[PDB]
Amino acid sequence: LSLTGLKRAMLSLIDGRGPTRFVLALLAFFRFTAIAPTRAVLDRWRSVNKQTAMKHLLSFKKELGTLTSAINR
Amino acid sequence: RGPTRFVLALLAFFRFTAIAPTRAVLDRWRSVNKQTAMKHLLSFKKELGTLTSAINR
Amino acid sequence: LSLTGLKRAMLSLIDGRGPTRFVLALLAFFRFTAIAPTRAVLDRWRSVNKQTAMKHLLSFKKELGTLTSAINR
Amino acid sequence: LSLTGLKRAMLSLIDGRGPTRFVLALLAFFRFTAIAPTRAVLDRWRSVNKQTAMKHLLSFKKELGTLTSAINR
Ligand SMILES: [Ca+2]
Ligand SMILES: [Ca+2]
Ligand SMILES: [Cl-]
Ligand SMILES: [Cl-]
Structure with missing residues (x-):
């Protein structure tokens, strides 16, 4: 579930911990959107x-x- | 709903993470x-x- | 072969006609290497x-x- | 002929040596164009x-x- 995946994101931005790629994905998103990362x-x-x-x-x-x-289509 | 860029950024993230988007x-x-x-x-x-x-540094 | 592709390239290089992506490939190359395109x-x-x-x-x-x-490996 | 940036790009494929960047650029080009590299x-x-x-x-x-x-313009 994307619910399982939402929550993950949410802990992941609270503590910097959790899956390497998820924290990096978060970082990319915090850059894509003009938002200052935690x-x-x-x-x-x-x-x-x-x-x-x-x-x-x-x-x-x-x-x-x-x-x-x-x-492009 | 909400900002075009935001929704797309979300989409990108949902693909970067192997998550099925809403x-x-x-x-x-x-x-x-x-x-x-x-x-x-x-x-x-x-x-x-x-x-x-x-x-790269 | 690649010599076929080579002559193809060289042709595309003097006269800029020939396959769209080939000419674009050439262009990328001329940028990758710091050379000024024809x-x-x-x-x-x-x-x-x-x-x-x-x-x-x-x-x-x-x-x-x-x-x-x-x-990366 | 009047192409300084060819005669070495010649060498490169019929002769594996020369600038690291150039050789990689050629490799890129050999992949962009569907050409099997030397x-x-x-x-x-x-x-x-x-x-x-x-x-x-x-x-x-x-x-x-x-x-x-x-x-994109
Ligand atoms: Ca890990
Ligand atoms: Ca064409
Ligand atoms: Cl986590
Ligand atoms: Cl041709």
Whole structure:
């Protein structure tokens, strides 16, 4: 459920903890929307493993792509 | 309901996280003005870019 | 073969005609490497169909993605 | 002929060596265009310094961005 997934987001922005990619997804969204991210989320963005952090951001880029080429029709 | 960019940002997030988006969010993704929808997605791509190059150091 | 593709490229390079995405690929290349494109290539980049031109550049972006996530291991 | 930025782009494929960025740019182009890259080009792709290789690929991504953004007007 997306309810399971909402709640996750909500704890994830309260504490910076929880799934690496979720916190990164949150960060991307906090940037997409002109919103200042929570200290707990920002704190994590400075700690995440460079290699893993890139893995995830890159697939976000990919996801955006499928959304873009979708709207090209 | 609410800001075009916000709903799209939500959509992006729902795809980044492997979460199935709510019908009300999906419903709007089919209605968005092609032109404006593009403008936004493209700026998302740009923001991801800033984050990537940041982690390259 | 690729020599077929090479001669194809070289042709597209002097006279900017030939396949839309090839000329756009060339253009990406001429930007990737800091080289100033031929008048014939540049002249086409102002004429390309907005929608088609977009389709292609987006696919390039995709291609680069597979290359980058490749280097992440 | 009167193309300084060809005669080395010549070398590159029939001769695996030369600037790291150039070789990766060629690789990008060989992927954008549905062309199978030369052994000598592919050989280098396996040897490039991961860190430098990513620096370059990410700047390509950026270049494609300016080109996309451009076509959106
Ligand atoms: Ca984890
Ligand atoms: Ca064509
Ligand atoms: Cl969590
Ligand atoms: Cl041809």
